Design a protein around this ligand. Structure first.
Ligand SMILES: N[C@H](CCC[C@H](N)C(=O)O)C(=O)O
Length: 420
């Protein structure tokens, strides 16, 4: 369920004019710095020459359950691995990406407890900790396009250390010298990459940091490495923790579930009741689109959670039903003017709306009621904001309401009205 997304120049011909980086995060599902950094990179950066291939979350099932690894430690599965392991197919996908001839370098992002120090200081600051370090398996990889791992790492670290938020967050180099006997790292992703003659690096941001600070450091590491590779790029924001926080918590983010209208990710009520979902369909098979890359659905008891990374955006209490795709549009009067409103759209209303009757279709405006009928048809009513019971809104702001259409016990679609 992981996916690779390309960040490429507009002109295909420019792809071969600078190096190619494979950027990977989310091998552990409870390390949101890494997968929020890949998400922001995908949403807000442009690559002008060369290519950056991104797997924003390697372990998506585990991310959805805020779990380090549902099927074990995915980053110990790159050497010996039983074909029956549930993640065996995913590991082969990742290995195939790493080993492609077009890839020159690999950057793997993680979050880790404490702060790495080369010497022991205390329980939080010591050599067994991984927070805020930039990691190589060895100094050099003979046969790579860019064999000088140590020089790249030192220069990337220098770049990150020019932008520290507090001196305790200073980055240090960790060279695990993996081939010489680090049996754990011999099973990990970056060692596999070195063995395919790729330049491979890992960045670990401290779990002691708030998310926006972790993401800040991961973005510094990405930029530092891109600069070393001479992959030119732009971003549409200033790289500081306040801007990172604003971009993670962006009110323009949305999720489109199945053929339903887009809903905002943020400021939803915590529970959406009687929420139509296609019947006879496993939750991971329900289509979901977003302008973010780390959104999904997951079952929890009798609810379906909408997830944005590790963040719970709402709890759907599903109404499983056949989705009949026959209805494409509905005639509505909006602020006195008829228009044909597409099923699955959001229509802004300043004053009022009225749904024209349809022969075999009933409309239920959720939050509007004329009687206590259990299958209402609310076509033919002129409806204003003041007619709604506000607690039925999708949003905490009480402006967005669902209109659901039904045809003979099947669901014919939804339109949202947004009062502006
Ligand atoms: N804290 C991570 C570091 C892995 C660093 C590098 N070997 C990689 O594969 O990215 C781990 O213990 O899996």
């Amino acid at each position: 369920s992981m996916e690779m997304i390309e960040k490429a120049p507009t002109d295909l011909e420019d792809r071969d004019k600078a190096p190619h980086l494979l950027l990977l995060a989310g091998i552990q599902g409870d390390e949101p710095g890494g997968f929020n950094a890949t998400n922001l990179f995908l949403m807000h950066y442009s690559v002008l020459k060369g290519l950056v291939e991104v797997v924003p979350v390697l372990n998506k099932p585990s991310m959805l359950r805020n779990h380090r690894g549902l099927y074990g430690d995915m980053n110990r599965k790159f050497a010996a691995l039983d074909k029956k392991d549930p993640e065996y197919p995913t590991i082969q996908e990742i290995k195939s990406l790493i080993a492609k001839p077009n890839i020159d370098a690999v950057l793997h992002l993680h979050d880790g407890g404490g702060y790495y120090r080369p010497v022991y200081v205390d329980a939080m600051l010591n050599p067994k900790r991984w927070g805020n370090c930039f990691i190589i398996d060895q100094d050099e990889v003979k046969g790579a396009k860019f064999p000088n791992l140590l020089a790249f790492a030192n220069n990337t670290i220098e770049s990150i250390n020019a932008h520290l938020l507090h001196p305790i967050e200073e980055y240090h180099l960790k060279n695990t010298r993996t081939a010489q006997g680090d049996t754990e790292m011999q099973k990990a992703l970056t060692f596999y990459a070195i063995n395919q003659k790729k330049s491979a690096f890992a960045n670990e941001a401290s779990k002691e940091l708030p998310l926006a600070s972790r993401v800040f450091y991961h973005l510094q590491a990405i930029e530092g490495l891109l600069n070393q590779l001479n992959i030119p790029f732009k971003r549409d924001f200033e790289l500081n923790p306040s801007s990172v926080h604003a971009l993670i918590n962006d009110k323009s983010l949305w999720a489109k579930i199945s053929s339903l209208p887009k809903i905002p990710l943020f400021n939803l009520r915590p529970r959406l009741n009687h929420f139509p979902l296609p019947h006879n369909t496993k939750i991971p098979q329900i289509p979901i689109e977003s302008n973010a890359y780390i959104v999904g659905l997951v079952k929890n008891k009798q609810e379906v959670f909408l997830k944005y990374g590790n963040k719970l955006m709402t709890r759907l209490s599903p109404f499983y039903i056949e989705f009949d795709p026959s209805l494409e549009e509905v005639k509505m009067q909006i602020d006195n003017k008829d228009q044909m409103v597409k099923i699955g759209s959001v229509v802004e209303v300043k004053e009022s709306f009225y749904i024209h009757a349809m022969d075999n279709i009933r409309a239920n405006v959720i939050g509007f009621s004329v009687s206590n009928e259990n299958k209402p048809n609310e076509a033919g009513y002129t409806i204003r904001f003041k007619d709604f019971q506000k607690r039925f809104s999708l949003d905490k702001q009480e402006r967005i309401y669902r209109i659901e259409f039904y045809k003979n016990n099947a669901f014919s679609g939804m339109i949202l009205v947004k009062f502006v």
